[PDB]
């Protein structure tokens, strides 16, 4: 009676060792719906993403081997799609549908390194009509949302305060931080000045009306990427 949704930033699916280790990690985790960022697939190369057990795959790619987002739905989930909006530039994809009589809107987002919070606010504006009270927005936001998302506990910048306001008008909240308020976990690891630096830039934001449905969430380290996956279970 529950479905599992998972977001992972994948760091490229062009090679087939990569695709095979994704498929078997996805098999293990066995999610209903899976949102993936940084496919690096061209739109000529969309056909290259096949995952045994996950045949329904919606993709928004760019004409280069950069960006690239997919939403994969498992063969065992009866998902009836009603709307799909793909970014021309491969940085977001929205799919609306229903699973067993319940409507669900998933916006999968890969914001850019630079100008991230401004980019997301603009995307929420372009897609204003489509947002509703059963909306999940997941992916690599390339930005913290709260002070506890940062190792330094520094205040969020004014751009990200601006995004936070915009989300609050759409009645969207950070689902992970809401279910785990004191969390000081991170989702992203890089090398900065010859040392490791940790951040929490991958999020599951969603409609505050969906909180009633949320069972477990958890962050999942992996050897597929420098990003950790977030998994969410809902009623």
UniProtKB/TrEMBL annotation:
Descriptive protein name: RNA-directed DNA polymerase
Organism, as annotated: Homo sapiens (Human)
């Amino acid at each position: 009676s529950h479905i599992t949704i998972l977001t992972l930033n994948i760091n490229g699916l062009n090679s087939a060792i990569k695709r095979h280790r994704l498929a078997s990690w996805i098999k293990s985790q066995d999610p209903s719906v899976c949102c993936i960022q940084e496919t690096h697939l061209t739109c000529r190369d969309t056909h290259r993403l096949k995952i045994k057990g996950w045949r329904k795959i919606y993709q928004a790619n760019g004409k280069q081997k950069k960006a690239g987002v997919a939403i994969l739905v498992s063969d065992k989930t009866d998902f009836k799609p009603t709307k799909i909006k793909r970014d021309k530039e491969g940085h977001y994809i929205m799919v609306k549908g229903s699973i067993q009589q319940e409507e669900l809107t998933i916006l999968n987002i890969y914001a850019p390194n630079t100008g991230a919070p401004r980019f997301i606010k603009q995307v929420l504006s372009d897609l204003q009509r489509d947002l509703d009270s059963h909306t999940l927005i997941m992916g690599d936001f390339n930005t913290p949302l709260s002070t506890l998302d940062r190792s330094t506990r520094q205040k969020v910048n004014k751009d990200t305060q601006e995004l936070n306001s915009a989300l609050h008008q759409a009645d969207l909240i950070d689902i992970y931080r809401t279910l785990h308020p004191k969390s000081t976990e991170y989702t992203y690891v890089r090398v900065r000045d010859g040392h490791v630096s940790q951040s929490k830039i991958d999020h599951i934001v969603g409609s505050k009306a969906l909180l009633s449905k949320c069972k477990r969430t958890e962050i999942i380290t992996n050897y597929l990427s420098d990003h950790s996956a977030i998994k969410l279970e809902l009623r």
